[PDB]
Enzyme design. Structure first.
Site, PDB file in Angstrom:
ATOM      1  N   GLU A  22      12.098  10.816  -3.574  1.00 35.16           N
ATOM      2  CA  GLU A  22      11.324   9.909  -2.733  1.00 35.16           C
ATOM      3  C   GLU A  22      10.752  10.545  -1.473  1.00 35.16           C
ATOM      4  O   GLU A  22       9.601  10.299  -1.141  1.00 35.16           O
ATOM      5  CB  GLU A  22      12.169   8.721  -2.316  1.00 35.16           C
ATOM      6  CG  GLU A  22      12.579   7.833  -3.446  1.00 35.16           C
ATOM      7  CD  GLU A  22      11.455   6.937  -3.951  1.00 35.16           C
ATOM      8  OE1 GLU A  22      10.372   6.856  -3.327  1.00 35.16           O
ATOM      9  OE2 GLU A  22      11.663   6.310  -5.003  1.00 35.16           O
ATOM     10  N   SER A  73       0.806  -2.193   1.556  1.00 28.95           N
ATOM     11  CA  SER A  73       2.175  -1.975   2.047  1.00 28.95           C
ATOM     12  C   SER A  73       2.380  -0.489   2.364  1.00 28.95           C
ATOM     13  O   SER A  73       1.560   0.349   1.971  1.00 28.95           O
ATOM     14  CB  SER A  73       3.207  -2.481   1.040  1.00 28.95           C
ATOM     15  OG  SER A  73       3.302  -1.641  -0.086  1.00 28.95           O
ATOM     16  N   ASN A  75       9.988  -0.148   1.347  1.00 27.69           N
ATOM     17  CA  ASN A  75       8.694  -0.818   1.420  1.00 27.69           C
ATOM     18  C   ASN A  75       8.591  -1.902   2.512  1.00 27.69           C
ATOM     19  O   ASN A  75       9.522  -2.667   2.741  1.00 27.69           O
ATOM     20  CB  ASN A  75       8.348  -1.389   0.036  1.00 27.69           C
ATOM     21  CG  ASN A  75       6.952  -1.936  -0.035  1.00 27.69           C
ATOM     22  OD1 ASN A  75       6.764  -3.140  -0.027  1.00 27.69           O
ATOM     23  ND2 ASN A  75       5.956  -1.054  -0.140  1.00 27.69           N
TER      24      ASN A  75
END
Ligand code: NA
Length: 128
Positions: free
Chosen positions: A35, A49, A58
């Site tokens: 990530e 977002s 998020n």
């Protein structure tokens, strides 16, 4: 801050992440690598977002960044708290994220890079 592997590993163990809701430390580590590359300042902008920090949380449902349409702020945290060198708030909000029915599958990258694979590599030689 860009954590080194065992350093990040030792902090997560200490923050209660190992086996949290059945998610091993090696999986949390694998999620963080894919990530954000272990970088707390990691930010990804999508059309509606933004994903923040080391676990790429998020802004739509989890944190409030004050610029996202329909924001629920389930972690009750500003998204800027997820860009801190100190990861206590990110771990806390990441724990909330996996309390949801999807679990760690909430992240598509886990499914593609960690799931059903040998993740022992993320914590080998760390004494964790
Ligand atoms: Na939100």
């Amino acid at each position: 801050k860009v954590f080194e592997r065992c350093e990040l590993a030792r902090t997560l163990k200490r923050l209660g992440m190992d086996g949290y809701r059945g998610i091993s430390l090696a999986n949390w580590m694998c999620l963080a690598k894919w990530e954000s590359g272990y970088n707390t300042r990691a930010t990804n902008y999508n059309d509606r977002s933004t994903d923040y920090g080391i676990f790429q949380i998020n802004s739509r449902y989890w944190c409030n960044d004050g610029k996202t349409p329909g924001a629920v702020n389930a972690c009750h945290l500003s998204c800027s708290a997820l860009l801190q060198d100190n990861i206590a708030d990110a771990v806390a909000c990441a724990k909330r994220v996996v309390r949801d029915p999807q679990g760690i599958r909430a992240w598509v990258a886990w499914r593609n890079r960690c799931q059903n694979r040998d993740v022992r590599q993320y914590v080998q030689g760390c004494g964790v």
